[PDB]
Amino acid sequence: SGLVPRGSPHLIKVTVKTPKDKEDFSVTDTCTIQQLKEEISQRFKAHPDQLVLIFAGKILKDPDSLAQCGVRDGLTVHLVIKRQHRAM
Fold it and tell me: Which residues belong to any copy of the Ubiquitin-like domain?
């Protein structure tokens, strides 16, 4: 409608799969791993340090963008959420 499209190139959807859960995330394609960790913390209610993200069998590193990692629209990132200890 008008000059504005229904969708965008910058707006992808990636599946975050844990051993127990499967959750979709709308993300920008240039979103960094650290920013995705933050989005995931807010979704699962976890601290980012709990989070381990894997794609193409590689543990993903905070500064990289999703695009640099090879994560594209409709693909799956694996997530392990390290369980909090009972005590410090």
Answer: 12-88
Structural contact between residues 81 and 18, judged by C-beta atoms closer than 8 angstroms: yes
Judge whether 26 lies within some domain.
Answer: yes
Q: Which residues contact 31 (CB under 8 A, 6 or more apart)?
A: 39, 65, 66
Annotated resolution, angstroms: 2.0
Q: Nearest-CA neighbor of 34 among 19, 48, 55? A: 48
Experimental method: X-ray
Distance, in Å, from the CA atom of 4 to the CA atom of 25, rounded to the nearest integer, reads 23
Distance CA 32, CA 55 (A): 14
38 lies in some domain = yes
